[PDB]
Amino acid sequence: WTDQSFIEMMTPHHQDAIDMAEMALQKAEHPELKKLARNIIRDQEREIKEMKTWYQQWFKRPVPAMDLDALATAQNFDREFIRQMIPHHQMAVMMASNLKTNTERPEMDKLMDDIIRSQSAEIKQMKQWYQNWYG
Structure with a gap:
């Protein structure tokens, strides 16, 4: 990834997560x-x-x-939400980890740290809820 390619892909990747999250607010x-x-x-x-x-x-x-x-x-919103969001989050952490080794920009280095830290923590939460609810 380069800064430019990363932003072009991560923007709609993020928008997809936001769209799914917005549906969670209702369902x-x-x-x-x-x-x-x-x-x-x-x-x-x-x-x-x-x-x-x-x-x-x-x-x-x-x-x-x-x-x-x-x-x-x-049939079960939460189950399907977690099923889809975990791999989606994982792809973001993976893209961010790569860009972190490619970029020279402090803005991007910090954004990568935030993405990796927060989405990794959210994967952990979702995995535990999934066991609690469906395990």
């Missing part, structure tokens, strides 16, 4: 999952905003433009 069963959803929305909306601002500063143009259907129809 989540367990209060723990709604709380996670609110945190995802808040943190990832903020990161999209930052990435957008940096992209235009660095490259002098705007940022160029999972299964919600399966989630909406699932």
Whole structure:
């Protein structure tokens, strides 16, 4: 990954997580999952905003433009939410870990640390809830 390619991919990747989280606000069963959803929305909306601002500063143009259907129809929302979000989070941690070894920008180095730290912690939470609820 380069800073530019990373922002182009992570922006819609984040937007997908936010979209799923927004659905949790309506449909989540367990209060723990709604709380996670609110945190995802808040943190990832903020990161999209930052990435957008940096992209235009660095490259002098705007940022160029999972299964919600399966989630909406699932018998158990929370189970399907966790099923989809864990690998999605894992892909973000993995992209961030790589960009961290490629970038020279303090803005990106710090964003990678935030992504790795927060999403890794959220994977841990989701894995434990999944065992508690369906194990």
